[PDB]
Amino acid sequence: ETFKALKEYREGQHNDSYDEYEVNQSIYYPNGGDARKFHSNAKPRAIQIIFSPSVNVRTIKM
Amino acid sequence: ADVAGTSNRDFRGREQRLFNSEQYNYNNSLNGEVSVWVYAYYSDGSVLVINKNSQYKVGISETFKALKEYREGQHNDSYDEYEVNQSIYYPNGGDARKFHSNAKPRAIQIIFSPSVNVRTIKMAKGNAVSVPDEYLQRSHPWEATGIKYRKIKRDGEIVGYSHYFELPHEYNSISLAVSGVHKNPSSYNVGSAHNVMDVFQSCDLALRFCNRYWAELELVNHYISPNAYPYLDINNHSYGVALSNRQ
Amino acid sequence: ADVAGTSNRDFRGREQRLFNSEQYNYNNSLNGEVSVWVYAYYSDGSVLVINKNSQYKVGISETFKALKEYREGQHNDSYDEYEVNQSIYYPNGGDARKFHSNAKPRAIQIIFSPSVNVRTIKMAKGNAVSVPDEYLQRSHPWEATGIKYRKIKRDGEIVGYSHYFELPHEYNSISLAVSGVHKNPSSYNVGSAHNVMDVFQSCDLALRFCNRYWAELELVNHYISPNAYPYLDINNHSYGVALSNRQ
Amino acid sequence: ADVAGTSNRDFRGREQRLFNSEQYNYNNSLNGEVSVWVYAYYSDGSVLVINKNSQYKVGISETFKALKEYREGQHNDSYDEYEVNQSIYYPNGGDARKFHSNAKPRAIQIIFSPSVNVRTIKMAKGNAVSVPDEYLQRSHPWEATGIKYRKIKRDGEIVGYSHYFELPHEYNSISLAVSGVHKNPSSYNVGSAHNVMDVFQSCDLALRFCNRYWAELELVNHYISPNAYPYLDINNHSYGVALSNRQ
Ligand SMILES: Nc1nc2c(ncn2[C@@H]2O[C@H](COP(=O)(O)OP(=O)(O)OP(=O)(O)O)[C@@H](O)[C@H]2O)c(=O)[nH]1
Ligand SMILES: Nc1nc2c(ncn2[C@@H]2O[C@H](COP(=O)(O)OP(=O)(O)OP(=O)(O)O)[C@@H](O)[C@H]2O)c(=O)[nH]1
Ligand SMILES: Nc1nc2c(ncn2[C@@H]2O[C@H](COP(=O)(O)OP(=O)(O)OP(=O)(O)O)[C@@H](O)[C@H]2O)c(=O)[nH]1
Ligand SMILES: Nc1ncnc2c1ncn2[C@@H]1O[C@H](COP(=O)(O)OP(=O)(O)OP(=O)(O)O)[C@@H](O)[C@H]1O
Ligand SMILES: Nc1ncnc2c1ncn2[C@@H]1O[C@H](COP(=O)(O)OP(=O)(O)OP(=O)(O)O)[C@@H](O)[C@H]1O
Ligand SMILES: Nc1ncnc2c1ncn2[C@@H]1O[C@H](COP(=O)(O)OP(=O)(O)OP(=O)(O)O)[C@@H](O)[C@H]1O
Ligand SMILES: Nc1ccn([C@@H]2O[C@H](COP(=O)(O)OP(=O)(O)OP(=O)(O)O)[C@@H](O)[C@H]2O)c(=O)n1
Ligand SMILES: Nc1ccn([C@@H]2O[C@H](COP(=O)(O)OP(=O)(O)OP(=O)(O)O)[C@@H](O)[C@H]2O)c(=O)n1
Ligand SMILES: Nc1ccn([C@@H]2O[C@H](COP(=O)(O)OP(=O)(O)OP(=O)(O)O)[C@@H](O)[C@H]2O)c(=O)n1
Ligand SMILES: Nc1ccn([C@@H]2O[C@H](COP(=O)(O)OP(=O)(O)OP(=O)(O)O)[C@@H](O)[C@H]2O)c(=O)n1
Ligand SMILES: [Cl-]
Ligand SMILES: [Cl-]
Ligand SMILES: [Cl-]
Ligand SMILES: [Mg+2]
Ligand SMILES: [Mg+2]
Ligand SMILES: [Mg+2]
Ligand SMILES: [Mg+2]
Secondary structure, eight states: OOHHHHSOOOTTSOOOHHHHHHHHHHHHSTTOOOOSOSSOTTSOSOOOOOOOTTSOGGGOOO | OOOTTSSTTOHHHHHHHHHHHHHHHHHHSTTSEEEEEEEEEOTTSOEEEEEEEEESEEEEEEOHHHHSOOOTTSOOOHHHHHHHHHHHHSTTOOOOSOSSOTTSOSEEEEEEOTTBOGGGOEEEEEOTTSOSSSSGGGOOSOBOOGGGOEEEEETTEEEEEEEEEEOOSTTOOOEEEEEEEBOOOSSOOTTSTTTHHHHHHHHHHOEEEEEEESOHHHHIIIIITTTTOOEEOTTOOEEOOOOTTOO | OOOTTSSTTOHHHHHHHHHHHHHHHHHHSTTSEEEEEEEEEOTTSOEEEEEEEEESEEEEEEOHHHHSOOOTTSOOOHHHHHHHHHHHHSTTOOOOSOSSOTTSOSEEEEEEOTTBOGGGOEEEEEOTTSOSSSSGGGOOSOBOOGGGOEEEEETTEEEEEEEEEEOOSTTOOOEEEEEEEBOOOSSOOTTSTTTHHHHHHHHHHOEEEEEEESOHHHHIIIIITTTTOOEEOTTOOEEOOOOTTOO | OOOTTSSTTOHHHHHHHHHHHHHHHHHHSTTSEEEEEEEEEOTTSOEEEEEEEEESEEEEEEOHHHHSOOOTTSOOOHHHHHHHHHHHHSTTOOOOSOSSOTTSOSEEEEEEOTTBOGGGOEEEEEOTTSOSSSSGGGOOSOBOOGGGOEEEEETTEEEEEEEEEEOOSTTOOOEEEEEEEBOOOSSOOTTSTTTHHHHHHHHHHOEEEEEEESOHHHHIIIIITTTTOOEEOTTOOEEOOOOTTOO
16 A cells, blocks of 8 residues: 555545645655645554464565 | 953943843732743644733633634534534543544643742643533542642743643543742732732733644744743753843 | 441441532532533523533623524524624614524523522623613622522432523523622631632633533433532423432 | 775775665665656646556556546546546547546656666557557557667666657547566576565565656656656656766
8 A cells, every 4th residue: 555545534524635635745755745734643643464364474574 | 432241341231131130020020920821732733822921810721622623714523523522521422423533632731931939820620521520529629730840941040830741541531721820929919908909900901812833843933932932842842031140 | 247237337338428428518618619500491402501610609601692502513594693693782783584593592590509608699681782781870780699599409408509590582682690609607708818819710720611412301311410410400300419428 | 094085995985885886786686676657747737656666577557547637635627527538438428528638648758767677668558448459359468668768877877767658649548557577687587486476475565656746847856856766857857866886
């Protein structure tokens, strides 16, 4: 997934879509955007990766 | 004339030092202001500041709702946020479409000006329905929290006092009021009969300010620093201007 | 050990009774809260509650406009409601598209906590432009209405005091303020010079709460009952919790 | 110590040169990335970039619709643009209110990193319904276009490879996929049985990036240059960073 694809998207609700384009520009290059917020609450705060028991753990790559 | 910075006849230097010393001491006289600031920090990095400036005594009191982030001229999920409030006032009392409102404060910083007497500070940190301690019947209406205030210092001078507390847990849903009295080392009680109606007028004359700044950088640059206010940032850096006996 | 509920050594029972008695008496000490609630009832069955909790004395003051129903996050006919207000402030002064605004309160209930002294209660029930009695020049700024307050009782104990008045007529357009002082059977005046600056701080520390609940059932279930507040419903049923000398 | 820039003991200089040489050669080892970029140029001067970075082999495949300009958070004539698409998929098949959609790309630039083997590059430039050459039955699924790629050079070093083609005609309505394999001058086949499951994992681990920049200046300043990517602008100016045996 891309940086953008992992950001929170609320289906059928407002998502500050224009400001969030500007947020993305500021994250891709420092000072590259014109957003109206310091930190987007759509950015993930954490990630958990889980595999089923049929994986071989030594093959996992990230 | 004597040469600058070489003798006791540098009257420009003596006047500069008195000008600053007079500002510092005027603020601490009974004719001066006492000020308080409440900073509510939001997860989007914005900060609501509420300031009250008044003679003799000063304070701020806000509801749970009033401390929540409000973005002027932008969408604020206003209907869902009513439902969030209902769920915070009573568990399972609302029908919101979110587990945690990002409008709830993540932290609070209370700052007083150097003219407060720290031993007079009182705080009522209530629950979301504005009760100080679980039930009204057993609630003392405030807690004297002065002992927890840190001195904000610049060049060795106290420029203000800070109490900071984070609200990182889901159950940290508060109402808040805070109060402090202007220093008064004299035995002239400002609230005794001679002057009590002036203290009543001070309740009317207190000036309030409130605004949401987008970042702590913006708060430092355009709110704290231009007005010579004291502040303590997330990196524990102290801001303010030392005035006593200084040029 | 002795068997429960059979002797004078049931310390768990003695401690339960003291725990409740202490809450009741703490509320009535000068260290306790005094609380007031204003309930504004609307024709859609919703109820606005405004609560203020403070030491020493407490009150609420609202304009005609502020008491009108406001549905958060829903349409409120905001332009027509400005025109309604103009027509209420002066007859034929507005251009509204309705004869009677359903946002006007149909009734008001004022409740005080049991720590108030009923003889101190004062109410300023003004007209729509915030004048207590027709013209300012002849207005006394309040009326002492304590005699009209009914005791709200539970298990024989006074849990609160209620004054209720309906506003069913087209001309019942009011502004409203109410005030009460905490009981003080002592001869220590809380506002004498020794303690007057603490009363000034109490003005700053008072906590306010306001919310619109959709029904009296919802108010009873999620506002009154969870917080052990006193209430009187439309069927004259008293709500609250008796604490003095009770388990 | 010896003086800088005067002898064979300038270890800081030798380490700087090795640091750059190691980056250049690591990229070209089988442990390194192979990257491709597709730039779609629009008449409003904006540019969509799609990048894919992966080990062993890499590619991008997009539909006619996916290459059309999409302005995030702005109006995009979305209903008329569905009708435009219907008219492009079959002549006279739609009901659009425009002759030429300004969302169609005016040009395409394909760039590969210097770790690609140019002889492995393949492109499927299909029609608007995703058929490579008029009809499926007679379509070879790609064309090996390596011979047309220009070297992008900086300080005499190849920093990347470019194929550029304009789409200035009304009939230039395409779908597009492109693919290249990482250089492998060895006789260890990365897709032979020993390592083929690592190539399958590389299909999963490939990282994609896509964004629309407002101008070629902005692309150069904030996309190409900060990331040390190769690029060729409309004035035939080459961008990139030479690393082999350089300080
Ligand atoms: N711990 C706790 N406090 C609660 C709860 N519900 C309400 N509170 C209030 O939360 C306040 C304490 O909050 P915190 O100091 O942030 O929580 P903590 O458990 O002490 O944890 P840390 O301070 O983060 O180490 C109390 O004064 C209570 O009034 C609950 O579920 N747990
Ligand atoms: N009766 C009356 N009161 C008015 C009028 N305009 C304003 N008022 C105010 O209305 C208040 C009395 O209202 P109500 O008690 O609800 O009316 P009421 O005539 O006594 O009738 P009921 O109480 O329903 O039996 C007074 O205190 C006035 O300030 C008017 O046209 N008629
Ligand atoms: N010339 C032409 N090509 C068509 C037409 N319809 C579809 N095509 C496609 O267009 C491609 C060629 O496009 P271009 O190279 O841009 O056109 P060109 O006629 O060669 O003209 P220039 O390159 O501008 O000199 C072919 O590969 C076809 O698949 C049509 O009407 N005319
Ligand atoms: N209540 C006060 N108001 C104003 N200035 C004060 C007050 N108390 C002390 N000061 C002065 O402020 C300066 C700093 O003194 P302070 O006691 O805060 O520093 P410290 O002893 O180094 O640190 P700390 O006491 O915080 O551990 C001194 O000039 C002191 O005289
Ligand atoms: N001001 C007060 N505050 C608290 N408790 C009170 C007060 N006045 C009386 N009580 C107590 O409250 C209880 C009820 O007394 P109260 O006089 O209200 O009842 P009553 O005489 O049956 O009814 P009422 O007087 O309303 O006709 C008794 O325990 C009484 O001692
Ligand atoms: N496949 C390749 N990968 C990396 N470097 C290469 C490759 N082929 C040649 N080089 C090197 O790149 C540099 C430029 O050589 P190149 O043949 O591109 O230049 P040229 O002969 O001046 O121009 P051109 O061949 O494009 O007409 C030399 O150092 C050459 O050894
Ligand atoms: N940095 C920003 C953010 C917003 N806006 C303007 O504010 C409008 C509303 O903001 P937007 O980010 O699109 O939010 P919403 O409309 O509330 O939500 P959504 O678009 O996801 O439905 C936009 O159309 C845009 O014109 C802007 O000028 N600059
Ligand atoms: N718990 C919720 C939240 C929202 N909605 C519906 O979704 C609509 C849009 O949501 P709202 O919370 O009001 O957000 P915005 O309109 O996006 O923002 P704002 O109202 O602050 O301008 C509301 O009118 C309401 O009908 C709902 O039914 N239940
Ligand atoms: N007496 C009135 C009432 C309404 N209107 C017009 O009707 C529009 C809609 O009415 P409004 O009272 O504002 O109601 P809503 O938009 O439905 O609700 P709200 O504004 O509270 O969201 C207004 O903008 C105004 O132009 C008017 O001309 N005269
Ligand atoms: N060929 C077309 C183009 C537009 N419309 C009508 O015009 C409206 C507005 O056009 P649209 O193409 O959707 O553009 P915008 O709303 O301006 O932009 P977007 O939808 O991307 O936000 C559409 O809802 C549709 O009803 C139509 O009937 N036939
Ligand atoms: Cl003084
Ligand atoms: Cl007491
Ligand atoms: Cl290798
Ligand atoms: Mg939008
Ligand atoms: Mg809304
Ligand atoms: Mg309106
Ligand atoms: Mg549309």
